Design a protein around this ligand. Structure first.
Ligand SMILES: [Mg+2]
Length: 60
């Protein structure tokens, strides 16, 4: 419900810093904020931070 904008990971991503998150393919990213065109912010598996926008696919 209150998950905001959500997406599915298209690829593996390893956080390059403590301000980034990591995810595996098919993981769900929620509460997405599109703070810029290349990098978004959201929640994945209880972690909060930045990730590359083109590594995910928006749901609906
Ligand atoms: Mg991984």
């Amino acid at each position: 419900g209150h998950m905001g904008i959500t997406a599915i990971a298209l690829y593996d991503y390893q956080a390059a810093g403590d301000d980034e998150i990591s995810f595996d393919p098919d993981d769900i990213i929620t509460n997405i904020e599109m703070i810029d065109d290349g990098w978004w912010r959201g929640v994945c598996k209880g972690r909060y931070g930045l990730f590359p926008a083109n590594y995910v696919e928006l749901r609906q």
